[PDB]
Amino acid sequence: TNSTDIFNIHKDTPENNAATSFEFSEATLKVVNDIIARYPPNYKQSAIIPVLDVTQQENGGWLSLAAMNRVAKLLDMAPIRVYEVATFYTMFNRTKIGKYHVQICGTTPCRLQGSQKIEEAITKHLGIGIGQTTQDGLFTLGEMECMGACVNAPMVAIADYTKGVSGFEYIYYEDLTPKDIVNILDTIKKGGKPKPGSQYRLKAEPAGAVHGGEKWVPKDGETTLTGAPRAPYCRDLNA
Template sequence: MASRTLPLFSCVAHNTFRSHMRLFGSGGGNGLSAVSGAVSGGVVGVVGAAGAVGSSHLLLDRGLAVRPFTSGKKSASASSTFVQSTSFASLPLSRSTSSRDHVASFSTNSHDHSNLHQPDQPDNSPDVHWDFTEANYDKVAEIVARYPSNYKAAAVIPLLDIAQQQNDGWLSVSAMNRVAAILGMADMRVYEVATFYTMFNRSKVGKYHLMVCGTTPCMLRGSRDVYAEISNHLGGVEFGDSTPDGLFTLSEMECMGCCVNAPMIAVADYTNGTEGYTYNYYEDLQPGDAVRIIDSIKDKGISSVKIGSQTRGTCEPKDMQTSLTSTPPGPFCRPLIKKEAEQKA
């Protein structure tokens, strides 16, 4: 895909000009009078103590940079460290760009799609009515009450979490709009949160959301084999896909904090809405363990499966109080309890 050349004068650059405009006097050469509406003013740069222009780039947005400044005029303020240049540079992006759908494939959740409106989902529209249940409104009120009235927006993540649980595991546009209305936020601010955090799903998922950790520790311990076994067992579904019966969705997640018990998967249960919602870890897996867990969930429900490590207690060594393969060389603890008993006798 070909690279694109974009104009350098972005909103980032404009803010830079506004914040430093006071450093330039009306008689300071080219001035900044033409900057407010056109790309004909100067570029703000940094100079050293001796007045020489620094060679560092000023990065503006991904792939955009100002070429090293080679000429410029000191500002009207003698103590200022800023200069202005007489021209802008428009540089190619440092790498090819593509559509948001393609960029979303780099997300840490393989099921997450960042595009806000998805035409293939007619119920994902701001025109579709959505609201919290009465029971969930009680939870919403309790959460919002934890924050000062002028900081209600701090509750956006827990409210989105409740909305996702109620909405069978995904966030529709109307659900996000409802959260925004309750918190007095602009809709776009809520969209930004929902599309940034990968635990929020912007597409429908199955009743059970299977998430395979693909980060380095799990990968080294066999997570790719676990994924391959799950995919084959579910009829060839890949990351981001759901089974035809809508029961399982398979996704890849990045580190979920159980590296010591790698490899692991997480399963989110959306079968009973908010009241029955669970999010459990299953650790120390062999490929066959993952298949057994899935079959047990399908036949008997989520409660039929042991949570956590499948082979040991928490992250303790499996057979003894050491991870060494031979007898520990010491030092050993003194038998104080035995010694105390002997003294009392």
């Protein structure tokens, strides 16, 4: 389960209903068929997760009931299994969301770094809380669990749905202060591309840190792997 999805059962809407119309594009159909080839034909049901994901980008960032029906008819499986899988996984959104999907880790290693400060800054600037969307349909805020970037905590991942499957982007933004995330959001709003990863270092190499969640304090100390890379070598396998 995730935000913006309080129901595990279908709800009727003029946008999402039994009369909803969806069909794959030729590029999307080709990509799905290529994905189909990764599994044996007698086990054709195993490719449901990537197909659901691709349909999710194709529709614009969420999955409709008609999309699930079409996927089930494509994979020759019962719709009930498709509904179960869709309700089982966090990334799969069953309701209409904004053009950009903002996800924040709430796990304790991120919390200690000042996660609530970043959340509060996002709430104060974008004007919406968790499970909410801007009136312009631009930014969608959501809360996530550990995203595997704890050394660069706090971190935020933002999903783009403005360029479809081929232009889909899932970018990590790490080592953030309220100023950092606000400027990232503003750059996205004006049409620019914010730089990925950490805002004060390249990767997980030793560097400074965020003290109190508000200020980056650089620090100098011992760093490894600073010499020339090791040459190829193998020992004598014989005896």
